[PDB]
Each structure stands twice: as structure tokens, then as C-alpha cells.
Design a protein around this ligand. Structure first.
Ligand SMILES: [Mg+2]
Ligand SMILES: [Mg+2]
Ligand SMILES: [Mg+2]
Ligand SMILES: [Mg+2]
Ligand SMILES: [Mg+2]
Ligand SMILES: [Mg+2]
Ligand SMILES: [Mg+2]
Ligand SMILES: [Mg+2]
Ligand SMILES: [Mg+2]
Ligand SMILES: [Mg+2]
Ligand SMILES: [Mg+2]
Lengths: 70, 104, 88, 129, 67
RNA sequence: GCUUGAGUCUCGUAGAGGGGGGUAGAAUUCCAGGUGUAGCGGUGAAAUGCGUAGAGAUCUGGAGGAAUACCGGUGGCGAAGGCGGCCCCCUGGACGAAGACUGACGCUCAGGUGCGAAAGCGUGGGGAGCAAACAGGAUUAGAUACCCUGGUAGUCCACGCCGUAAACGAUGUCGACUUGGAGGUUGUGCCCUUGAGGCGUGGCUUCCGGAGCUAACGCGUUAAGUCGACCGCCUGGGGAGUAC
RNA sequence: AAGGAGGUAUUCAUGUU
């Protein structure tokens, strides 16, 4: 995130752009994830659980648009 | 015979030796019965990041069909020459005799 | 594996036309050629178990083919193993 | 590996009846044709036929009476792992004569009733109820 | 969506064709996901290899910081 | 004898399959300097520790070791263990298209042989980070722990040994039959490719579900359904996977 | 960190920037 201050843009706008660039690059998430060593088994288990619950929510939504609740 | 694609980057201050190297390596291959399909001197290009504090390295690209022994000898020549800053040889499935996007 | 020219050469040597590629002697000759070829590989790379397993599969398949040929026609079996220089 | 084609044939019959299929098809052999003839004459299948010169395919057209399958149970008795032979006195009674056991006697394959009438024993291919 | 390679009959991505890879790398220099770009998986793998080879040959930057 | 099972040949396809050798960048640490000054580090809060011999911070140069962000995916490969930067050399397996060839050459397998995470052991190197043991500081009624500051074996390499794991799908291998749906990945054929389309046909793979099965939970064409072949095991809990 | 919207997520051109 290398933000250049443009002409006539106020400081608030420049800071908003820099914040959005940092959030889009995802630096802080990387740092927080690399703060402590996580075992390969833990990484795999977390990945699998995330996939399972995401798929389950997608399937629940698809079922919901098939069965009325009212 | 295998088709090797060689891209080597030379020190910007040896741009005058770059024509000599091309002929020497091509002659090595041609004596080795290898065939030079493509040869594109890309020239002075600005590096995306500094290599040995250098910028603006001289790129040459050369697509060849030549035996492994001569190719390995050429790679050792690149290793032990201090004008070639970088090299990369890649096996290819077929000979490419088109014109690179750096010339297109 | 074996290059196309080598396979065609062996087929010509051991089969009774250019197009007989499945005969037992042809199969045994191809297996023997490949097995002999890999000995250098497994003399330099001695920790390549994943390839040595395929090598042992080749050896075992050659054994089964030689057993079938011996039990089916003894003359072809003797001629083949004498040409190839294999024990038993 | 396929090591009991007769058991495979009986299994296809059973599964086709459970899946309400009109007809089932299998690779042919003369033992299979004999068994299908016995079943047809005892009224357990509606028909059979053979199609093919080099690789014959046996087609059996199955029978249903009140929606339900005609063959209620059919189990291979003699199998490659355990062959069963019975003297004429010890021939089995399947469903107390309401069903039929297919016996391979020295004069061909027949039902247990036919073998007991002809005074012969043999191998017990299958029970049909 | 619209994987831009299948529609053009692309057989192999070229590490030399920088501009195309410039379309598929982000500002920081990391590879953009296929879930974002809509690229098919096979061309995504080819693209990753080509981008890494270009990074090695210094036609693309590993990161924005070094230069 | 035959060709349908099993194999061989032809052309391709994808792949973190394996072994060896190079190479790149980011980062950690250390060293040498330049600038610079009173803190740095850590915790819930502190202290031990580092620093006026100039630390921490910033810039440049160098050394070395280990691992490969993004791509990355209930994606792929492998018999399982497992495999992740890029390039080369050697090499194993799988799948598809059309055709030819051999002619049952097949399946399973006691004993036997081979491979087998991590820790561990022997000899010889290497050692940046992490870190059993250990040392110190805290917390606590106590704290031989959780937390903090350091830190040795070890992790890495070469060659041998070891032979075990919740080595798990807690599901032995092979073959045949039995309604469907939505997808993923990898091949291939046809039609108007009108433009990423439509219609087929093979491989592997995730979820839902019918009949059926099941004690139930649930499995459900990749079965735990209906069968065939061979192999391994079980016989109340404990003592005990212990003694000899 | 909190709140709203859209989706299983983008086509929405390029241009501009
Ligand atoms: Mg082969
Ligand atoms: Mg054993
Ligand atoms: Mg170890
Ligand atoms: Mg040791
Ligand atoms: Mg030691
Ligand atoms: Mg500690
Ligand atoms: Mg055990
Ligand atoms: Mg077990
Ligand atoms: Mg076996
Ligand atoms: Mg289900
Ligand atoms: Mg014991």
C-alpha cells in the first residue's frame, strides 16, 4: 500500500484511501495469522471446518428458496 | 532432440559484448547439430527490481533445438561468465518459431 | 520408459510380423529391456522407492508371463530365455 | 473376479425383481440356459431367449402377478467355496414342495421333484421360492 | 466471470507476455485469485507458473517494496 | 480352440508422484559501519532480561541456516506414510481416442520380502528460528504447570538402526447387479462455434436422497444394498496387550 | 470494533483515472 497524496484531495480523503488500500492488501490479517506458529493439523482442521460450514449455509439457502416459511 | 528456450540477462555495461555472445553460443549449438529456431535480442530493459544493484539489463531470448550435452555446457558457460547476470533454460514441447510479445 | 524406436526394434526381432505386439515373447523382451535399463538408475538413486516399486511390478509380470509360456509351450520358453539370457 | 456366474445370474434375477424391471440380460452359457429353461417350465419367469452369435446374451422377461415379484426368494446353495451333493433320498423339500430346488443330475438339470421321481441325486444349484 | 483464456483458444500462457500477467497481478504484486478473476483452474495454474517465472526473470515484481 | 476378463503396441493429457543438482525473493538472527538518544522488551498487571562500553529505531554492506507468502481449491498425485517457489537431468504410475496383437496368461494370499509420520538411537557435519530438560521472574494456600525472559538435546544434512500412531473412511482385496439430483476436476465425439452454446461418451472426486439395510445413529451405484472368491480378526469388564 | 445493502457475484464496457 503505497498511497500518493493527490492535489486538492484533503487529508481525510487521503487517509481513507490509504486505509482502504491496506484493508484490500490484507496486511494485518497476515500479521495476526503469523504471530504464532499453528500446526499443520490445526491448519487443515480449520480449513475443513470452514469449508463444511460454508457449504452447509449455501445448501440451507438453496433449500430455503425451495420451501416457503409462510 | 529436445527444444530448449534460453533467456539470459547481461550486464548493461557489456551490451557491446552481447552480439559476440550470441554468435558464439549459436555456433556452439550449430556445431553440436542443434537448430536455432528463434533469436530475439530484446535489448536494454528496465528491471522490475534491482539485481546486484544494477538496473536496465540487456535481455536476449533464444529458442533452440539442441542436445542435452551442449545445452549443459552452455549453462555452465553462463554460470562461469560474469557478464551474464541471469539465465533460465526451459524445456518446451515443440519448437516455437513465432515472434515474441516483446517484439510484437 | 522405452523409446518408440527401441520398442519397434524389439517387436521386429521377436514377433512374426511388424504388427504382432502382444505375443508373450515380445512382452517378456520389452520387460527385460526396461528392467536392464533401470539398473543404472537404481544403482545411482538408491532411495527411489516409488520407482523401485514399479520396477518390481515389471519383474513380477515378467515372471508370470514366463510361467505361462513355460506351461503352454516348452520349446518357445527355452528359446526365449536362452536368447534373453535369463536364468530359469 | 467373477467366479460364480450362476450366482451372478440369480443375483441379477433377484435385483431385477426388486427393482421391478421388465427384463434382465446377462452373458450366456449352456448351464444358464438349462437353468432358465427349468425356471420357465416351473413358471418363475415369463420367458427367456438368447441373442448373439459369438457372445450370446441371455434375456429373461420376468413375471409379476399382483404387482409383486413372482420369485420371493432365490439363493445359491452349491457355490465354488462349498459344493453340495445329495443322494436321491436326501434331496431337499423347499417350502414343503411349494417351491423348487434346481438339481443337476446325471441326465441334465431338473427340479427336485423330477429328480426324486427319476430316482437320481446330484448337485444342488439353487433354491427358488 | 468470463475466463478470458478459453474464449481465445489459449494453449499455454507465456511468461514473456507481461501485459496479460499485469492484468492478473494486484498492485502489491501478489496473484489475484481465480475466484475473483473467473479464470478456469488449468489456466490459473499455468498463470501462476508464468508469473513466478516472470518474477524470476525480473519482468514483474515479487512485491512493491523492493522496487 | 474362441474373445468378453487380463496384458502388449500407436498418439496424446493432467499431476505438491519419486531421486539428484542448481537458483530467487521476502523475512528472522548475527556481524561491520552511518545517523541518533534514553529507553527497548514483556504482561491482565509486573519482574527477570537488554541498554549510556550507546540499546531499541532508520540506511548501506556482508555471513549463514531453514522454509517457500499470493496462486490454493471438501483442487491434484501416490499402495499407504506422504507430497507445495522456479529450472534442468534420471524415473514410476493413471486416463482418453481409434485400431491391431496374445489367447484365461486371472483373483486372493498363511509364512516371506519391501515401504512405513513424529519422537528416539549410533557415527560425522551444520546450527538462523523454534524449543523438551534446565535457570531465573511472576501467579497461587501451594504451582515441580498454564504466563514472561533466556536456553541444551532436538528439529536440518549423509549413512545405518527403529517399526510404532485416533498409521482413521475407526469401513480387508477383487468382480457382477440395483431408481435419481446438484456440483468439482481431467480427457474425448457431434451439431449452427452463430458469442464463453447445445447434445453425447469415459476416469477420478464432494454433497443430498429412494428402495433396501441398520439396534439406532446413519450408508445409500465410491453401499454399511443383493451376491461370488480368498485373506485378517472377535467371543463379558478388569487384571492385560501385562507376566513367562 | 459497530450498522446497512447486495449476492454466493459478478456482466455492468472502455474511457477516465
Ligand atoms: Mg507402460
Ligand atoms: Mg504377513
Ligand atoms: Mg526424526
Ligand atoms: Mg541424531
Ligand atoms: Mg550430533
Ligand atoms: Mg518458554
Ligand atoms: Mg497398532
Ligand atoms: Mg485399526
Ligand atoms: Mg495383493
Ligand atoms: Mg446420503
Ligand atoms: Mg509387552
Amino acid at each position: 500500500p503505497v498511497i500518493k497524496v493527490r492535489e486538492n484531495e484533503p487529508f481525510d480523503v487521503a487517509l481513507r484511501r490509504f486505509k482502504r488500500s491496506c484493508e484490500k492488501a490484507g496486511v494485518l490479517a497476515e500479521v495476526r495469522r503469523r504471530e504464532f506458529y499453528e500446526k499443520p493439523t490445526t491448519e487443515r482442521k480449520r480449513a475443513k471446518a470452514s469449508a463444511v460450514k460454508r457449504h452447509a449455509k449455501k445448501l440451507a439457502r438453496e433449500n430455503a428458496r425451495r420451501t416457503r416459511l409462510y | 532432440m529436445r527444444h530448449y528456450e534460453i533467456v539470459f540477462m547481461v550486464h548493461p555495461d557489456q551490451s557491446e559484448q552481447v552480439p559476440g555472445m550470441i554468435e558464439r553460443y549459436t555456433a556452439a549449438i550449430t556445431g553440436a547439430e542443434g537448430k536455432i529456431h528463434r533469436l530475439e535480442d530484446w535489448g536494454r530493459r528496465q528491471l522490475a527490481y534491482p539485481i546486484n544493484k544494477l538496473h536496465k539489463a540487456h535481455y536476449v531470448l533464444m529458442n533452440v533445438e539442441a542436445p542435452q550435452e551442449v545445452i549443459d555446457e552452455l549453462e555452465t558457460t553462463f554460470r562461469f561468465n560474469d557478464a551474464v547476470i541471469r539465465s533460465m533454460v526451459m524445456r518446451t514441447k515443440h519448437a516455437v518459431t513465432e515472434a515474441s510479445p516483446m517484439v510484437k | 520408459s522405452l523409446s518408440t524406436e527401441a520398442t519397434a526394434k524389439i517387436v521386429s526381432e521377436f514377433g512374426r510380423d511388424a504388427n504382432d505386439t502382444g505375443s508373450t515373447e515380445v512382452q517378456v523382451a520389452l520387460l527385460t529391456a526396461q528392467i536392464n535399463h533401470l539398473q543404472g538408475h537404481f544403482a545411482e538413486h538408491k532411495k527411489d522407492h516409488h520407482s523401485r516399486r514399479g520396477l518390481l511390478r515389471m519383474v513380477s509380470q515378467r515372471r508370470k508371463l514366463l510361467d505361462y509360456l513355460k506351461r503352454k509351450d516348452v520349446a518357445r520358453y527355452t528359446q526365449l530365455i536362452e536368447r534373453l539370457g535369463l536364468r530359469r | 473376479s467373477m467366479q460364480d456366474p450362476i450366482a451372478d445370474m440369480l443375483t441379477r434375477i433377484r435385483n431385477g425383481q426388486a427393482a421391478n424391471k421388465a427384463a434382465v440380460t446377462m452373458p450366456s452359457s449352456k448351464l444358464k440356459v438349462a437353468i432358465a429353461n427349468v425356471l420357465k417350465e416351473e413358471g418363475f419367469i415369463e420367458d427367456f431367449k438368447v441373442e448373439g452369435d459369438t457372445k450370446p446374451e441371455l434375456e429373461l422377461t420376468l413375471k409379476y402377478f399382483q404387482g409383486k415379484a413372482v420369485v420371493e426368494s432365490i439363493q445359491r446353495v452349491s457355490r465354488p467355496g462349498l459344493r453340495i451333493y445329495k443322494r436321491k433320498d436326501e434331496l431337499p423339500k423347499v417350502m414343503a414342495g411349494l417351491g423348487i430346488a434346481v438339481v443337476s443330475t446325471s441326465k441334465g438339470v431338473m427340479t427336485d421333484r423330477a429328480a426324486r421321481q427319476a430316482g437320481l441325486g446330484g448337485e444342488i444349484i439353487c433354491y427358488v421360492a | 466471470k468470463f475466463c478470458r483464456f478459453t474464449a481465445e483458444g489459449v494453449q499455454e500462457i507465456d511468461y514473456k507476455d507481461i501485459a496479460t500477467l499485469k492484468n492478473y497481478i494486484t498492485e502489491s504484486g501478489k496473484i489475484v485469485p481465480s475466484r475473483i478473476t473467473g479464470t478456469r483452474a488449468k489456466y490459473q495454474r499455468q498463470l501462476a507458473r508464468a508469473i513466478k517465472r516472470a518474477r524470476y526473470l525480473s519482468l514483474l515484481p515479487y512485491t512493491d517494496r523492493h522496487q
